[PDB]
Scaffold this active site. Structure first.
Site, PDB file in Angstrom:
ATOM      1  N   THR A  94       0.818  -1.208   0.000  1.00 58.30           N
ATOM      2  CA  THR A  94       0.000   0.000   0.000  1.00 58.30           C
ATOM      3  C   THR A  94       0.854   1.260   0.000  1.00 58.30           C
ATOM      4  OG1 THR A  94      -0.181   0.248   2.396  1.00 58.30           O
ATOM      5  CG2 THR A  94      -1.628  -1.344   1.330  1.00 58.30           C
ATOM      6  N   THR A  95       2.060   1.194   0.561  1.00 58.53           N
ATOM      7  CA  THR A  95       2.975   2.324   0.465  1.00 58.53           C
ATOM      8  C   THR A  95       3.632   2.403  -0.906  1.00 58.53           C
ATOM      9  OG1 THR A  95       3.426   1.928   2.810  1.00 58.53           O
ATOM     10  CG2 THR A  95       4.794   3.548   1.678  1.00 58.53           C
TER      11      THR A  95
END
Ligand SMILES: Nc1ncnc2c1ncn2[C@@H]1O[C@H](COP(=O)(O)OP(=O)(O)O)[C@@H](O)[C@H]1O
Ligand SMILES: Nc1ncnc2c1ncn2[C@@H]1O[C@H](COP(=O)(O)OP(=O)(O)O)[C@@H](O)[C@H]1O
Ligand SMILES: Nc1ncnc2c1ncn2[C@@H]1O[C@H](COP(=O)(O)OP(=O)(O)O)[C@@H](O)[C@H]1O
Ligand SMILES: [Mg+2]
Ligand SMILES: [Mg+2]
Ligand SMILES: [Mg+2]
Ligand SMILES: [Mg+2]
Ligand SMILES: [Mg+2]
Lengths: 528, 532, 87, 526, 155, 98
Positions: A94-95
């Protein structure tokens, strides 16, 4: 403009269009990426966000940080949406998705400023993403042997890699082993609701345990509960959905009698109904009684008199986990409490864990569920531990679905950048610039890793590029050694679908952002 | 902990903020670059309207709060003061340099290395320009000056009018030429009085073979045309004589009051008689003239002009050979005026220009002077014409003083970018990136030129870079250095034969000033803003 | 005031709302160099532009007393480097 | 107030919106006065913020009283003022033409054509317009009074004074002819200073006339002075005829008894000496721009001399031009040639309830006063504006003896010439050239619209007629709405007016097309 | 360094990203670490006086005016009214120590404050905080092993 | 065509290049623009595509009608000419089937 006595759109409508609008969108995306930039890698740092009510959330997961931010920019919301999508489909990266999308936009910003048509950039992004996904699928390493030991080692390495970026990275081997065990105990659907996670304040992280069974907190015992034995060596568990207490037979029921004999008969009938239910439960042979519905004090004392254990108001999910572990069936009626609808466990025990009492169902050989008990010094500590374990569990589930791994630490993206640059060197040249920009943007993750670790990103990137040029697919960033190393031999493994979904989502977000040329904001209604 | 009554910014935040301010200033004026550039309409929130394309004027009129934006505005002002042209280009180049330098800094490249690379790149660019890209104007002639003026007046309100305005500018500049000591031909621009008046069209603006005064005769009695003028320049008021503070009149015998009062004006009468006895025809004074002296001049059949501007009077005296006389006192302690202080001109006329009158001193002897009367449609158009005319005059002065010119249309920028990106690999390990970024940022000028014409900037700049690379690689293709941009057709074109030229000083000063401004802004990584 | 502003370029005639600055509102301020000079309030008790000019001049406040150019002449003011004929 | 690179009140807009807004503002400015063009125009009532009423149909008068916020409208108003100041006629025409060219330019701006191409096409078109106007012009004989009167009539037929057209034409022609001057080889007219228009409400407009001299609203300083002198010798002065203080501080110190009376007697003697110096020339009328003392009045009446004091400087200059005198400041330096001989009658007569001084029989005067007597002040102001237009037209045709057909003929002829010129361009700029050429048809179209005839049929007929060889003088009859040859109708205009109108309209279009960004809100920063 | 970051775009157009971004503060990196260490040091220095047999009591007053004279660290920190999130972390640490053991709720806060105070001067010399945390983990493992080594069993 | 971000009165974000969708989320106030929007929505309901065609054709027709009114034509003449031309176009269209 002109006053135009009768206007087209109502007052307060805001319209922005042209190159400045898209440049502003790219800048907003850059800001959103910077908001979570320093949370990537084993040297990443957690972010603390305080909401309106004063609650503070500490996390390293990019999706959580983005969700907690009250982003209102229409273009910036795309990064949050794609981070949420990556979290939903994969659970990790997700980063990376936000950084990749913002890097794409930043790389193509100079070409936007000079008037290049957005459709060319969109086509170049689509072509580059298709080529990168094909390359990832081609060069991903898979083991076509289905060896139990090798598969377990692969799952453990993937869990360790997915866990070596959080506050539990010091004990990453222990947590990874428990996560692999918990996933392997799941039967066929790998349902997330079948892995209970319990957070108990106090105790070290090493005190956290995985229960080969089910465990839940004590639920509002009544008088006489303390007289029930709290340990059984081969109990039969009665899973019920029954309210065991004196109450009205029905909500609309009404009793009409005209004789005191009938009055006493009615009272005795109510008592006999309750005692008949209790007698059926007792004669079923069970020793432990669990019910979703409340269990009254009369039933508690009745069960205590028979050296039997009762626990009412058990949460429904905990009863489902108990059914899946012990192997019984939840009964709404006690009329037929046969032997095949009663759960069995080797040992039942109630023990104190950090100021709280927990019921334990261990020794289940056919259990298809688990229960994580997490210990920590604060509720946010345990929340972040749960988030990290959720990421690891998602990664292990995906690896179970398919064992296709690529070395992490930026090695895969360095190889992809080399391949994309080599491809771009052999095309006319209008698309070559954009494909080269895509390849250059693919270098953000190793650069971000070096920046977070405190290295010199330029030298490490140059060494990685030189290594990948002369052969060597799995050379990434060695964080501990201040240098580069073969990450595949270092067991820094990632599922291929992680990077595949990351690239796909980042490309889709970048194309959607670039395709937008005008933004219109209508005034918000019911101003009051 | 600091307990400083103010706000503090540190690290990437302040650097990004400074780059933001510089980029905003650049984007303000980016749309007014090149022949396909368009003017801007500024309103001074009291109803005053200004229409202009000059970058310095736009940046001076705007209200600026950020210190870096103020730095860029002062940079534009300095470029206008020291050169007079390329005011938008220097700002754009400086902002692009700052943006690329900050992009390098964000990659953990130390700002000192970036500054050293920028300094080296600027020095090498100046050296390369001087060695290769300059063209000597000795073998070109008046055509070079005409082409330089036309190129300067492109993007201005007098663009298509260039075929005539260039001739007017060249004639006006050549009229005021003088040689000082050391035999250096010096061209004193700003000695050309530019007068504006709406009315007739641009094509029929007048270039005066003399000087033009925005003044009229003091009284209707005097004639408004004198043929063989004898100009007498004075720096004192011709009024009734009044004693200074230290002198006070006290009367004890009443019979002398009339004599005192009569002498009080007879002094000025005698001064005027002395002035007019030598044959003076036109009398110009910075001070006022009252009614009696005007009557004296009317009866003498001369001209009297009062409240003449000091600079105008000095220019008139220098052109006509007259000498300013603050007083009629000689070295004998007497009060005399001699004919040797009289300046002569071939004609002095009070011409009528759109319901108003002005004085034309035509064909002054002993020195040639020039003035330009700009005719337009309204005040705003005339003001913009004056600004463009001043830019053209400055460009012509630069070309005539330094006899080196360079091709326009971004050819110099593309050649510099190619040469610098090739030279960066010669030396350095980390400043190599700084030199490469300098070369890349030098391409913002042709990019903006292409964007302003709605042409494909990528293809045009790629073709320009290919042409210049071939010029720099193949010894026999060195004639391709002049390949610039033809914005009318959106194709590369040899600007040297096309007649698109700029003074070398413009490019050199723009590069130096932009590099220094970028270095100055790049040194800041912390800002403290104390509350007022 | 609009008519008078034409003849008095040295003055800074202006108006301002009373609300932004009701005892003085239910039913002409003169400044010079930052200090108050004239404080005539409710001048209707004591009109035409000539009347206002005479009223202000009788108090010795309005400055005591212009050819019209073509449009304008001035461009700037600096070291113009005027022509200096030599040799 | 974080960051704020620019000030918080600085608003910036750019792009197609700015061009569209500028063109729409110009079109609105044109639409304001669109109906005030032609012989059948209707007047408008403008309310002066100072409380006055301006009732007129002049374009410049209407636009000057309108306050606007959009700077394009300010540019258009400045254009109107420039046209009024330069030639004095064609003020509505230039505004309408500028609006039409800006509209046809917006047409191309909606497409992908850069404004510079439109500007270059406009400049080429303007050059061809000037060439065609010069080609289709005819000369005029200034010695022919009848044709000068016809030109003035064609100029003033679109104004309210057109009813008394013969009287207005005669007044304007006589004033312009007599104010014409020649000195030192320099020719001048100077209607601004001399040829003063004095309007007195009341009476009838049929009594208006231009005098062979100057009339002022002044009376004799003392009743005993004559109010009627046959052949006065007029002397003009600037300095006061009264004892004034010196420039230097001149404190006295009286010790003896007789010094006070001696000082007063010397004041009287100085006044007497000045009066004797005046009388030495033997004049009959003395005019002074400043005060005259009562003792001076007595000493002048002793020599039978009429004295008038406190005369404006412009009036004194006008009197000097009319009666051939020179204003003298010092009486002791007065000489014979300064005495004004040439006035043939001076008479102070009462009009209404005021005394007016008439010097109205000068021989060969170089200045005059137009005495307008009408119904009211506003009507007299409108009559003065119309007569100013007439005098400006007369001056323009006197300076330039070229003449151009009117009533839409010139616009259509130039449009046709430019159309056949653009027929052989074979470029991308031919379309704006043709569009701005055909934009000239807005003048005949406006004439037809104001007349009330069918616009489309009349314009089609006129365009078809202009395609023939000798049809450059065919226009529209603004009173009947029919095609008619202007060598029969007699409507003609000076070439200078048409040239100025065309140049100003084209340059306004260019100036407003050059602009694509607007920033506002910053202070003056003086 | 505070109130987030505002740009308002380089073209002058409004530039809004986060709701109410003009009323939200933000601390980043080393300054945030220093502020957290300051808060933790303050809490630990307040607690350290109540350590040992000679430790003195803290006399807490709640929002209703009721007074609680006490020496237990967990109780003192739970009844404290703090806004700093690091102070809340200290309170939660004391509560966790009380829950797991019931004794030593004051020693934990003092030890954490001392550890963060030392980490402050370690950061001032240019060490990544993750490296400091890893070293602390290694030293804690060594200390726990030593504690197991020198322990004694009682009946 | 380029996508557009539209924020309605409920802060709901629409990213599309569909003319009917864009017009639906816009707060159109002018009655004539409202009528043209209703025409576009009717086209969307009847067919499902061609809303942008309807909008641009209506705009072009109205601009050319404005030009015709300016040059001298009456409203009735423009309306009858448009109706005749529409009938002619409907007659022509079947012959253009490929
Ligand atoms: N031991 C390691 N050595 C080098 N790089 C690593 C190591 N562990 C993880 N990484 C890298 O850190 C990156 C970020 O992973 P993480 O922060 O766990 O989740 P996300 O991908 O959502 O940021 C991954 O792309 C991975 O390649
Ligand atoms: N005819 C032309 N063809 C191509 N380029 C030109 C032409 N005239 C000027 N240019 C280029 O356009 C650029 C912009 O000039 P401009 O911005 O108008 O001057 P300034 O920077 O002084 O305002 C100049 O650098 C010049 O090289
Ligand atoms: N009798 C007439 N018949 C037809 N056209 C006329 C007649 N008199 C004047 N015109 C036309 O009307 C125009 C004058 O309009 P006018 O109201 O004077 O506008 P402006 O004041 O701006 O000149 C001239 O161009 C002239 O050709
Ligand atoms: Mg991860
Ligand atoms: Mg220039
Ligand atoms: Mg007229
Ligand atoms: Mg203790
Ligand atoms: Mg469709």
């Amino acid at each position: 403009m002109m006053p135009t006595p009768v206007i087209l759109l109502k007052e307060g409508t805001d319209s922005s269009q042209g190159i400045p609008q898209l440049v502003s969108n790219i800048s907003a995306c850059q800001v959103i990426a910077e908001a979570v930039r320093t949370t990537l890698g084993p040297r990443g740092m957690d972010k603390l966000i305080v909401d309106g009510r004063g609650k503070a959330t500490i996390s390293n997961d990019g999706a959580t940080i983005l969700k907690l931010l009250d982003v209102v920019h229409p273009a910036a919301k795309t990064l949050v949406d794609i981070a949420k999508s990556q979290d939903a489909e994969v659970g990790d990266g997700t980063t990376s998705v936000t950084l990749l999308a913002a890097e794409f936009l930043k790389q193509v910003k100079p070409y936007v400023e000079e008037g290049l048509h957005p459709q060319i950039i969109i086509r170049a992004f689509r072509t580059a993403t298709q080529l990168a996904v094909n390359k990832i699928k081609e060069i991903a390493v898979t083991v076509k042997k289905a060896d139990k030991v090798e598969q377990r080692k692969l799952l453990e390495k993937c869990a360790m890699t997915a866990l070596s970026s959080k506050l539990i990275s010091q004990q990453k081997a222990f947590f990874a082993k428990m996560v692999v065990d918990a996933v392997m105990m799941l039967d066929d659907l790998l349902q997330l609701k079948m892995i209970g996670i319990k957070k108990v304040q106090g105790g070290a992280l090493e005190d956290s345990q995985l229960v080969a069974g089910v465990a839940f907190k004590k639920t509002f015992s009544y008088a006489g509960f303390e007289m029930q034995p709290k340990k059984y060596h081969n109990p039969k568990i009665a899973l019920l959905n029954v309210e065991l207490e004196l109450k009205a037979e029905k909500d609309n029921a009404e009793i009409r009698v005209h004789t005191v004999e009938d009055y006493q008969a009615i009272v005795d009938a109510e008592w006999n109904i309750l005692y008949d239910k209790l007698e059926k439960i007792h004669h079923s042979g069970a020793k432990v009684v669990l019910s979703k519905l409340p269990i009254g004090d009369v039933a508690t004392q009745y069960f205590a008199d028979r050296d039997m254990f009762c626990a009412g108001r058990v949460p429904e999910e905990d009863l489902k986990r108990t059914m899946m572990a012990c192997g019984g069936s939840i009964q709404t009626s006690v009329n037929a409490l046969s032997a095949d609808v009663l759960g069995r466990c080797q040992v039942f025990e109630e023990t104190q864990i950090g100021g709280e009492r927990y019921n334990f169902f261990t020794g289940c050989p056919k259990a298809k569920t688990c229960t994580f008990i997490l210990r920590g010094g604060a509720e946010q500590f345990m929340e972040e531990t749960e988030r990290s374990l959720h990421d690891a569990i998602m990664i292990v589930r995906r690896a179970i679905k398919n064992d296709s791994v690529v070395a992490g630490g930026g090695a895969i993206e360095m190889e992809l950048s080399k391949y994309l640059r080599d491809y771009s060197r052999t095309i006319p040249g209008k698309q070559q610039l954009l494909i080269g920009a895509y390849a250059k943007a693919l270098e953000i993750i190793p650069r971000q890793l070096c920046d977070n670790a405190g290295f010199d990103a330029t030298n490490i990137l140059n060494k990685l590029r030189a290594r990948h040029a002369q052969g060597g697919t799995w050379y990434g960033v060695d964080i501990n050694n201040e240098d580069i190393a073969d990450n595949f031999e270092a067991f820094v493994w990632e599922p291929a679908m992680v990077r595949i979904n990351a690239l796909t989502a980042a490309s889709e977000a970048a194309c959607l952002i670039v395709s937008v040329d005008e933004t219109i904001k209508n005034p918000r209604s019911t101003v009051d | 902990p600091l307990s400083v009554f103010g706000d503090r910014s540190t690290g990437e935040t302040i650097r990004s903020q400074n780059v933001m301010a510089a980029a905003s200033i650049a984007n303000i004026v980016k749309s007014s670059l090149g022949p396909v550039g368009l003017d801007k309409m500024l309103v001074d929130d009291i109803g005053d309207v200004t229409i202009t394309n000059d970058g310095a004027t736009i940046l001076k009129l705007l209200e600026v709060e950020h210190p870096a934006a103020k730095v860029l505005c002062e940079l534009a002002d300095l470029q206008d003061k020291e050169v007079g042209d390329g005011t938008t280009s220097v700002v754009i180049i400086a902002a692009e340099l700052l943006k690329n330098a900050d992009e390098l800094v964000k990659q953990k490249i130390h700002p000192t290395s970036v500054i050293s690379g920028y300094r080296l790149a600027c020095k090498e660019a100046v050296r390369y320009i001087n060695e290769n890209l300059i063209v000597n104007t000795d073998e070109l002639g008046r055509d070079c000056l005409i082409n330089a003026a036309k190129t300067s007046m492109s993007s201005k309100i007098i663009g298509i009018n260039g075929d005539f305005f260039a001739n007017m500018v060249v004639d006006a500049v050549l009229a005021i030429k003088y040689t000082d000591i050391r035999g250096q031909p010096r061209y004193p621009v700003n000695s050309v009085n530019i007068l504006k008046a709406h009315g007739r069209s641009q094509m029929e603006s007048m270039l005066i073979s003399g000087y033009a005064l925005n003044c009229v005769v003091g009284s209707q009695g005097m004639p408004k045309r004198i043929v063989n003028a004898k100009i007498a320049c004075l720096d004192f008021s011709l009024q009734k004589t009044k004693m200074k503070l230290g002198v006070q009149v006290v009367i004890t015998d009443p019979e002398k009051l009339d004599q005192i009062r009569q002498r009080e004006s007879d002094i000025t009468k005698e001064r005027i008689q002395k002035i007019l006895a030598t044959g003076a025809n036109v009398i110009l004074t910075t001070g006022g003239i009252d009614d009696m002296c005007l009557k004296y001049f009317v009866e003498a059949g001369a001209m009297a002009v009062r409240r003449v501007l000091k600079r105008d009077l000095k220019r008139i005296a220098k052109a006509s050979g007259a000498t300013i006389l603050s007083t009629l006192a000689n070295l004998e302690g007497e009060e005399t005026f001699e004919a040797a202080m009289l300046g002569q001109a071939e004609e002095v006329v009070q011409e009528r220009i759109c319901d108003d009158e002005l004085i034309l001193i035509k064909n002054t002897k002993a020195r040639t002077s020039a003035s330009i009367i700009l005719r337009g449609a309204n005040d705003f158009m005339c003001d913009e014409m004056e600004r463009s005319l001043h830019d053209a005059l400055c460009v012509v002065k630069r070309v005539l003083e330094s006899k080196s010119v360079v091709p326009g249309g971004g050819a110099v920028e593309a050649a510099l970018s190619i040469y610098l990106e090739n030279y960066a690999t010669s030396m350095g390990s980390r400043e190599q990136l700084a030199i490469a970024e300098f070369a890349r940022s030098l391409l913002v000028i042709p990019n903006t030129l292409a964007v302003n014409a709605a042409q494909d900037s990528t293809d045009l700049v790629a073709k320009l870079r290919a042409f210049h690379n071939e010029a720099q690689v193949n010894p026999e293709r060195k004639n391709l250095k002049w390949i610039g941009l033809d914005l009318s057709n959106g194709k590369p074109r040899d600007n040297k034969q096309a007649g698109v030229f700029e003074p070398t000083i413009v490019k050199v000063k723009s590069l130096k000033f932009a590099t220094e401004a970028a270095i100055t802004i790049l040194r800041i990584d912390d800002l403290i803003k104390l509350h007022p | 005031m609009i008519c008078l502003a034409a003849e008095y370029p040295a003055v800074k005639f202006c108006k301002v709302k009373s609300s932004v600055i009701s005892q003085f509102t239910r039913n002409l301020l003169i400044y010079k160099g930052g200090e108050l000079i004239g404080n005539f309030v409710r001048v209707t008790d004591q009109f035409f532009a000539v009347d206002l000019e005479a009223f202000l001049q009788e108090f010795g406040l309005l400055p005591e007393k212009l050819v019209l150019t073509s449009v304008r002449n001035s461009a700037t003011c600096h070291s113009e480097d005027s022509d200096l004929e030599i040799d | 107030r974080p960051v704020l690179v620019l000030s918080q009140n600085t608003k910036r807009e750019s792009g197609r919106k700015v061009q569209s807004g500028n063109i729409n503002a110009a079109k609105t400015i044109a639409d304001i006065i669109r109906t005030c063009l032609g012989p059948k125009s209707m007047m408008k009532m403008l309310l002066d913020p100072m409380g006055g009423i301006v009732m007129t149909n002049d374009g410049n008068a209407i636009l000057r009283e309108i306050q606007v916020q959009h700077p394009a409208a300010k540019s258009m108003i400045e254009i109107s003022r420039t046209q009024d100041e330069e030639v004095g006629d064609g003020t509505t025409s230039v505004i309408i033409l500028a609006g039409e060219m800006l509209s046809v330019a917006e047409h191309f701006l909606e497409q992908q054509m850069h404004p510079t191409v439109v500007i270059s096409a406009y400049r080429k078109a303007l050059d061809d317009m000037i060439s065609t106007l010069k080609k289709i012009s005819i000369p005029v004989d200034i010695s022919d009074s009848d044709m000068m009167l016809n030109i003035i009539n064609s100029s003033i037929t679109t104004k309210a004074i057109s009813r008394w057209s013969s009287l207005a034409c005669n007044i304007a022609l006589d004033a312009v002819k007599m104010v014409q001057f020649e000195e030192n080889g320099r020719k001048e007219i100077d209607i601004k200073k001399y040829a003063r228009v004095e309007k007195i409400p009341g009476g009838i407009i049929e009594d208006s006339c231009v005098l062979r001299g100057v009339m002022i609203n002044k009376d004799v300083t003392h009743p005993r002075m004559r109010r009627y002198i046959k052949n006065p010798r007029i002397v003009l002065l600037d300095s006061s005829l009264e004892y004034k203080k010196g420039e230097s501080q001149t404190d006295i110190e009286i010790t003896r008894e007789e010094d006070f009376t001696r000082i007063l007697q010397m004041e009287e003697e100085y006044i007497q000496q000045l009066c004797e110096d005046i009388i030495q020339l033997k004049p009959d009328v003395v005019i002074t721009e400043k005060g005259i003392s009562d003792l001076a009045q007595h000493y002048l009446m002793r020599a039978n001399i009429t004295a008038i004091r406190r005369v404006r400087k412009t009036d004194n200059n006008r009197i000097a031009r009319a009666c051939g005198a020179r204003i003298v400041s010092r009486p002791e330096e007065l000489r014979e040639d300064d005495v004004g001989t040439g006035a043939g009658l001076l008479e102070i007569k009462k009009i209404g309830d005021e005394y007016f001084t008439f010097i109205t029989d000068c021989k060969d005067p170089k200045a005059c006063t137009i005495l307008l007597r009408g119904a009211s002040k506003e009507i007299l102001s409108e009559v003065e504006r119309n007569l100013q237009d007439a005098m400006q037209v007369c001056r323009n045709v006197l300076l330039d003896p070229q003449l151009v057909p009117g009533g839409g003929a010139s616009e259509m002829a130039v449009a046709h010439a430019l159309t056949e010129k653009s027929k052989a361009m074979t470029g991308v700029e031919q379309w704006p050239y043709r569009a701005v050429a055909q934009a000239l048809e807005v003048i005949p179209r406006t004439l037809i619209q104001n007349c009330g005839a069918s616009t489309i049929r009349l314009l089609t007929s006129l365009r078809a007629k202009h395609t023939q060889e000798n049809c450059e003088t065919w226009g529209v009859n603004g009173e009947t709405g029919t095609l008619v040859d202007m060598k029969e109708l007699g409507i003609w205009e000076p070439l200078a007016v048409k040239l100025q109108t065309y140049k100003t309209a084209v340059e306004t279009a260019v100036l407003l097309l050059r602009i694509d960004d607007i920033v506002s809100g910053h202070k003056k920063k003086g | 360094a505070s109130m987030g970051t505002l740009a308002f775009d380089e073209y002058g157009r409004p530039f809004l990203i986060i709701k109410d971004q003009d009323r939200k503060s933000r601390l980043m990196g080393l300054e945030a670490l220093k502020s957290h260490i300051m808060a933790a040091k303050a809490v630990a220095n307040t607690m350290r006086t109540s350590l040992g047999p000679n430790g003195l009591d803290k006399m807490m007053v709640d929002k209703d005016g009721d007074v609680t004279v006490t020496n237990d660290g967990a109780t003192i920190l739970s009844m404290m009214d703090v806004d700093h999130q690091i102070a809340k972390l200290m309170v939660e640490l004391s509560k966790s120590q009380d829950d797991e053991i019931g004794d030593g709720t004051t020693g934990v806060v003092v030890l954490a404050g001392a550890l963060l105070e030392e980490a402050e001067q370690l950061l001032d010399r240019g060490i990544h905080p993750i490296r400091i945390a890893d070293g602390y983990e290694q030293a804690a493992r060594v200390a726990i092993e030593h504690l197991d080594k020198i322990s004694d069993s009682v009946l | 065509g380029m996508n557009k971000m539209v924020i309605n009165h409920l802060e709901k974000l629409f990213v599309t290049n569909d003319a009917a969708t864009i017009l639906r989320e816009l707060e159109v106030q002018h009655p004539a623009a409202k009528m043209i929007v209703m025409a576009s929505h009717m086209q969307e309901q009847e067919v499902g595509d061609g809303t942008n065609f309807v909008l641009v054709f209506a705009g072009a027709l109205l601009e050319l009608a404005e030009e015709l009114l300016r040059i001298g034509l009456s409203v009735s003449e423009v309306i009858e000419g448009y109706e005749i031309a529409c009938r002619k176009a409907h007659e022509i269209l079947p012959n253009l089937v490929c």
